[PDB]
Amino acid sequence: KPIWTRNPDDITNEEYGEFYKSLTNDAEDHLAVKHFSVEGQLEFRALLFVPRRAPFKNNIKLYVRRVFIMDNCEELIPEYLNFIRGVVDSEDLPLNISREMLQQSKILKVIRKNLVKKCLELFTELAEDKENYKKFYEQFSKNIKLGIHEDSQNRKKLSELLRYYTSASGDEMVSLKDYCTRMKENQKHIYYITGETKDQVANSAFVERLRKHGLEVIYMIEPIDEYCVQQLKEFEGKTLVSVTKEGLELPEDEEEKKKQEEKKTKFENLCKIMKDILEKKVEKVVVSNRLVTSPCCIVTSTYGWTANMERIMKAAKKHLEINPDHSIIETLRQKAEADKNDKSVKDLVILLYETALLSSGFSLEDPQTHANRIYRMIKLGLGID
Amino acid sequence: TKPIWTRNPDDITNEEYGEFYKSLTNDAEDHLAVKHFSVEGQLEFRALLFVPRRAPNNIKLYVRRVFIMDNCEELIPEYLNFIRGVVDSEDLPLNISREMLQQSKILKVIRKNLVKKCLELFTELAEDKENYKKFYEQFSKNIKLGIHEDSQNRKKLSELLRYYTSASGDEMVSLKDYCTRMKENQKHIYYITGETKDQVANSAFVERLRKHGLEVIYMIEPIDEYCVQQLKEFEGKTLVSVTKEGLELPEDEEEKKKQEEKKTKFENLCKIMKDILEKKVEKVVVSNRLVTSPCCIVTSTYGWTANMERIMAKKHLEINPDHSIIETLRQKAEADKNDKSVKDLVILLYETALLSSGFSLEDPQTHANRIYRMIKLGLGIDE
């Protein structure tokens, strides 16, 4: 009887491996196996393997009552699981199944969903262990994320398999579950940032105040992440919020939120002056709740292009946020209220906007005009006319 | 009767050239140009070639008026694959396979004559500025790809290039015309590659060339970078990029020595700047190309251009010896070389120059914090 025939028993990992080695011209053994049976309304068994190396249409061998049928049945498993290798042996399915009598086979749909669920269950089992799950995640994290994007019925359990660096995780990629265990009691949102490297997003202005209130930020630093997070809207009832987007909501604090409204009142006239100087370069100028040491940042619209998203694909609406507790912003407010058409006010507004542009991941529309702004402001700093 | 390509061209009206071209191509317009010639001698053939009006290969091969094959790609180099027409050879065997043709010396001779007659046709079109514009808007990239790929015809292809220059206004002009306006002591043809005309025209790299009245060619298409790599000289004048190290201006007895005096004078600040910057650059040197800007970033003679490191680079920082910021910086650095504001200002100038020269910062937010420090300095704020 073939290896997949045997009640799940009497098989060592090295003979599972040799059979996985028969099936694949792999020179290493499998990283994982899931070997199950389904009895009942339908009857079939399946023996599935996760390889140790990402190979890059599935090649899962389909048998019917122990007779080989076909070698690349794409119906068997969704594309994001096409690294799975193995055998499926269905007890009752047409022996001459026409090649597209197949996308419509209902026996196959039941098989396929059982394959998907036992694969996800296998991945969860590997997760019940961190060492080997690291080895899996390094090879197939992009498969998990594309599953997030394309597979709605399985998106929750797939999200339980995501791992990310965070502001609290150090050198380790950790789970969303763990992030949730460390949340502050009045924290409703899961905060993330998208960017190119850990060190750019970790030191960005968008995290300053979140870092100083002790709030954890997830670092999503792969391009697929930008594509992944659009479909992953919540985890455990907590919604995912990007820190590079307008209208960041911090943990509920009645007293702190009153002082922020007072600051909005106080800076409303400077916001209109800046919005006037800047023209159509930004959509609005508003008071920030997310900055500490930096005077301003550029955030993108709620339903518009991310800075990283317009970076990634083609290479987006912008809001300028000003820090109400920054000496540069306070000085600027005083100069703008003494004279709004002051030339140095306009110069400083445009310079802060462009600097915020470079900080927020965008490109300048005229770098050398920007350079001459830098030179003028340097000469001011050294006392040169 | 007579196939059109065998007939005496004095007997063929352009309208009949056009109808034939339209049968060949199913083009709903007639040709933009036609070249119809014969070659006699040790090899004999006739050829009838057409330039289409629109940028889209299909040259039909006959032997002694017998149709042989329909897309003989080997008759003509790839950069001329928009040409359409017919070639009729007296000398090939009638059973010539496709494979003996790629290897054929007869074919090679035909191909060289087709190329030379195409280039001659393009020159004829260039005798009329307006119709030439319509050719050049469609096929300028083919000319530039020929520059890169065809070393034996590179000279004549270069006579077909047209560019905006600092002197041409809205008109794309020739290299010969650029040369007519060159200074008595100007050996080099200056160009700059970039993304838009206004970006290269107002760059720091042209400041001093513009103030000495020296003309700069604006190469603002992505193919341009690929093209100039191979186009090394025109009419004996070498092409020089103004974004590369070691720009040479026209000879001048007082300006050579004067510039050497400025190098001597800033040599010590250059070494301090180069120790502050570390490996971020290989050299800091005195510039001869800036006026209003204090510094710029230039790339190495045999290294990667900025446009090249976008797609996927050795950098020299040049400092303007006649700029108040550079002069102030020299005095501060010679009073004390470890001054914190010296280091901060040097790094700020370097990164600003990086942004200006088309490169990316490796940490935008560190750069931003430098900006903020220097803003507070200019406003009189402490930290």
Curated annotation (Swiss-Prot), chain A:
Catalytic activity: ATP + H2O = ADP + phosphate + H(+)
Annotated GO CC locations: apical plasma membrane; axonal growth cone; basolateral plasma membrane; brush border membrane; cell surface; cytoplasm; cytosol; dendritic growth cone
Positions with a binding annotation for ATP: R99
Modulation of this protein's activity: In the resting state, through the dimerization of its C-terminal domain, HSP90 forms a homodimer which is defined as the open conformation. Upon ATP-binding, the N-terminal domain undergoes significant conformational changes and comes in contact to form an active closed conformation. After HSP90 finishes its chaperoning tasks of assisting the proper folding, stabilization and activation of client proteins under the active state, ATP molecule is hydrolyzed to ADP which then dissociates from HSP90 and directs the protein back to the resting state.
Record PTM text: ISGylated.
Region described as Interaction with NR1D1: spans on this chain: 316-385
Chain intervals for the UniProt region annotation (Interaction with FNIP2 and TSC1): 1-315
GO-annotated molecular function: ATP binding; ATP hydrolysis activity; ATP-dependent protein folding chaperone; CTP binding; dATP binding; disordered domain specific binding; DNA polymerase binding; enzyme-substrate adaptor activity
Sites bearing N6-acetyllysine, chain numbering: K142, K157, K188, K284
Interaction with NR3C1: region residues: 1-315
Subcellular location field: Nucleus; Cytoplasm; Melanosome; Cell membrane
Record keyword DNA damage present: no
Keyword Cell membrane among UniProt keywords: yes
UniProt keyword list: Acetylation, ATP-binding, Cell membrane, Chaperone, Cytoplasm, Host-virus interaction, Hydrolase, Membrane, Mitochondrion, Nucleotide-binding, Nucleus, Phosphoprotein, S-nitrosylation, Stress response, Ubl conjugation
Superkingdom, taxonomy of origin: Eukaryota
A GO biological process held by the record: positive regulation of defense response to virus by host
Region span, Interaction with FLCN and FNIP1: 1-385
Modified residues (Phosphoserine): S152, S175, S327
Family named by the database record: Belongs to the heat shock protein 90 family.
Protein role: Molecular chaperone that promotes the maturation, structural maintenance and proper regulation of specific target proteins involved for instance in cell cycle control and signal transduction. Undergoes a functional cycle that is linked to its ATPase activity which is essential for its chaperone activity. This cycle probably induces conformational changes in the client proteins, thereby causing their activation. Interacts dynamically with various co-chaperones that modulate its substrate recognition, ATPase cycle and chaperone function. (Microbial infection) Seems to interfere with N.meningitidis NadA-mediated invasion of human cells. Decreasing HSP90 levels increases adhesion and entry of E.coli expressing NadA into human Chang cells; increasing its levels leads to decreased adhesion and invasion.
Free-text note on domains in this protein's UniProt record: The TPR repeat-binding motif mediates interaction with TPR repeat-containing proteins like the co-chaperone STUB1.
Subunit details: Homodimer. Identified in NR3C1/GCR steroid receptor-chaperone complexes formed at least by NR3C1, HSP90AA1 and a variety of proteins containing TPR repeats such as FKBP4, FKBP5, PPID, PPP5C or STIP1. Forms a complex containing HSP90AA1, TSC1 and TSC2; TSC1 is required to recruit TCS2 to the complex. The closed form interacts (via the middle domain and TPR repeat-binding motif) with co-chaperone TSC1 (via C-terminus). Interacts with TOM34. Interacts with TERT; the interaction, together with PTGES3, is required for correct assembly and stabilization of the TERT holoenzyme complex.
Protein name, per record: Heat shock protein HSP 90-alpha
Native source species: Homo sapiens
Taxonomic lineage: Eukaryota, Metazoa, Chordata, Craniata, Vertebrata
Portion held of the full protein: 294 to 699 of 732
